Subunit: 178 residues, 5 copies
């Protein structure tokens, strides 16, 4: 019944037993955000000397898989998620441990990808080129790079009017905008 704490109670290197798969990290990493459950470890908390085991690991009834990204964040202040981990189980772990900074960023991600699908795609831009027939072949083959043919449409077919008169063709052409 605690006479005093245990020889490792302040060690540099701390062993966590996050739900089964043991983790390794330096006590001081845990002192990054001083409102987290884990900040207790950082400060030698004597309430934890019954949730430590045989190896002197700290125990944690939570999911080792999801924990990683968290422990990394504490290590360098960055969000790392492999492409198969499910970000919501990262949220649930961010809350449980209580890392106010992180939780903001996870829920940023969660929107960022519910955004990522949402779009109206490729804001196409259109242009109406006009020419006579005598240069139709020309106008079509000498379009600019990237632009596509959408439609063209006659404007009067069956000889002219007088010693002058309106062009003869339109042509609408498009381009992407990625």
């Amino acid at each position: 019944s605690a006479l005093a704490q245990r020889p490792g109670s302040v060690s540099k290197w701390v062993r966590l037993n996050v739900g089964g798969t043991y983790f390794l990290t330096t006590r001081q990493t845990l002192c990054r955000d001083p409102k987290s459950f884990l900040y207790r470890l950082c400060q030698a908390d004597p309430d934890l000397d019954s949730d430590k085991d045989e190896t002197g690991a700290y125990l944690i009834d939570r999911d080792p898989t999801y924990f990683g990204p968290v422990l990394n964040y504490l290590r360098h202040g960055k969000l790392v998620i492999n492409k198969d981990l499910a970000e919501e189980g990262v949220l649930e772990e961010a809350e449980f441990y209580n890392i106010t900074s992180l939780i903001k960023l996870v829920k940023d991600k969660i929107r960022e990808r519910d955004s990522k699908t949402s779009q109206v795609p490729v804001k196409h831009v259109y242009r109406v080129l006009q020419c006579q027939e005598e240069e139709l072949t020309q106008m079509v083959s000498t379009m600019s790079d990237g632009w596509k043919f959408e439609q063209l449409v006659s404007i009067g077919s069956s000889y002219n009017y007088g010693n002058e008169d309106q062009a003869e063709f339109l042509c609408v052409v498009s381009k992407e905008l990625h």
Copy 2:
């Protein structure tokens, strides 16, 4: 008399508290929680309880029993979850697990987001203008004459939009 319980699930070991293995008291797991003299021999030398089931699927099961949510990693197949939910007898989860299966099954739809349309009208003079100026999201499908000889039309013109 320990708060903690080790589980040898198919081979790999799992750590968790007596407290988490009784959130649903009809389950198999509940007996462990209850310090049962009928699952004593099903412990190994290091103390764990032995459980002839694949663990890679037993993950999400144990998470639910912790925070009451469903957490499935993109690659893990739901169908393998369900079997473990049903083997362990955790009805509330099974409900959730079959809702995921119906959830993502119905996504085979090649049934697209319905395009709405509009039929614009303008004269020749403001046609180039009309086209280039075109508002946000609207694509161009076709235009047509109404004869280039009382206003009525000079040109008509169709255009589409997505509505997801």
Copy 3:
């Protein structure tokens, strides 16, 4: 009337625990010899008790799952071809069927057949044109439309619309 219940497998390095009884679902399979406690494999047992098996464990999961619950559970990363080979070596006829249905299921899914279309020509005068196109039922896409004279009564326009047949 003995009950030596549990047994450890050293499949390819990574251990496995499963009950004697699980390994007696297909009595024509290699694993049935482990189940009967065969003296001819006492020298394929290491120190820790387990049975040595010179095969890939990443794929031996699905195979052992079938013998627990009689179903085919395959994660999306694991390639089914590897489940087949293991299924053959261990010799689980029932399973070798199931695994070979999966492959033909999927390796004939990647064959992408053109979508069929149904096509109709409507016909609507100028006034009621706008109305026609913007009201269209679900699925029906636009295709073309043509003036029939652009200038008595008749019909003013026609129009082709179309719809997937998935």
Copy 4:
């Protein structure tokens, strides 16, 4: 020189039988199948042989030696297999993997699925029919009036078909 042999590729143990490692006698591994006096420093406490390489990619290789097939999990990089194949020197497997890599590279590059076209003809009355009764797989492209105000043709109508 027993029967069973333990490796230790990159710090994650492998188990296999002498017999699997003699398949190719011009590969590094072959020395571990004979019982080499000069690869006995590189044994550890557990008796296993030590190998400074990456055990992710080593699996496939070791598989090929057991049953002569190139099995790969979908996520893993073939380029990493190639490289581990080469190191160990299995000329058979380097060929199989350099097949796999050519087999899927330049995947995203098809010869332009050629198109064949027709030009259907009809009159006022059967118009609706011609379109509504179109052969399997042909697509609509364009239709044309021929002078709308003793019979002749009234409507000409182009149509395509993909040739996969």
Copy 5:
């Protein structure tokens, strides 16, 4: 009591990176004299307290990104699997200070973000002209690779012609 450890004067070096043990040879870690690792390579005294109860040196970083690092060293080539986050490697490269790696790791991060290639693979366009009678023919005896686009009528009520016809062709 004898003399020395059947395994002290050893080529082999155990790391306990973030909690999952890695094995490698002294000769491997030394590939870049500038890196953090180069020190454990050379059995540094200012690290003899980051070793554990069984000889492996300790590193507070994430193994699941380490891998690639320890590979590049072994064989001077960048390997990452399709599911690992390329960004997370950059950090583990920058912490260890492997300069040649950090030029590669970033070049891949460009390489695939630098790949919105909706870049319209080009099309050349032509304008054909044929009468009514030989209008079915043109369309079908049309050359290899060309597609149809649109066609436009020219005056229905002298031999010349009666229809234009636009037709595309891809430029792969």
